């Protein structure tokens, strides 16, 4: 069922709502209801990540609703992860900062379902260089705290985040990430604890994941 729903949304997303022959709203609600009930398979997650990150004519409310119901029924592939990472930052190809925040939050919430979580370590710089962008900083810090390994904690990165903390006047999410850096190099001098951003989402994701056994 799901592939036909995505088919319809993807074709409607190429057309301004003014010019569509039928409104897309009922198919959005069918998709989001199906996502909530069954989650999405790895192939469907790629298709969904495409309409979430490409520039198209879907409205922001529908895009947020899909993201909030983007429950993986199985695992999350490297291609999906890299689609969301490629959508981060400033650019004519890129989605709103508000959506980027939800993508980053989602990445934290499905971290244990990534097929190769180490792939985030290979794009560490993309994530780290965006810490200036205050609109996504809390979600960046949380994701970076999960991804940071010793090899990422290079002196230039230690200083940039010390400089950013000073210049912003202190920021508890930057302080949290600095404490992760501190775990590796305790000579760094340094209040956010990065708990799960949505325990309800976790419980419902777990219920969907329960069916795999």
Residue numbers in the entry: 8 to 197, 205 to 227
Question: What did the authors write?
Answer:
Instead, we found that CENP-I from another fungi C. thermophilum (ct) is 62% identical in sequence to thCENP-I, and showed excellent biochemical behavior. Due to the high degree of sequence similarity, we tested whether ctCENP-I could form a hybrid complex with thCENP-H/K for crystallization. It has been shown that the N-terminal region of hsCENP-I is necessary and sufficient for interacting with hsCENP-H/K. We therefore purified the corresponding N-terminal region of ctCENP-I (ctCENP-INT), which indeed formed a stable hybrid complex with the thCENP-H/K proteins. We first determined the structure of ctCENP-INT at 2.3Å with the Single-wavelength Anomalous Dispersion (SAD) method. ctCENP-INT adopts the HEAT repeat fold containing five pairs of helixes α1–α10. A following helix α11 folds back and packs against the HEAT repeat with extensive hydrophobic interactions, which likely contributes to the protein stability. The structure of ctCENP-I is similar to a model of hsCENP-I proposed previously, except that helix α11 packs on the surface of the HEAT repeat in our structure. The structure of ctCENP-INT in the complex is very similar to the apo state.
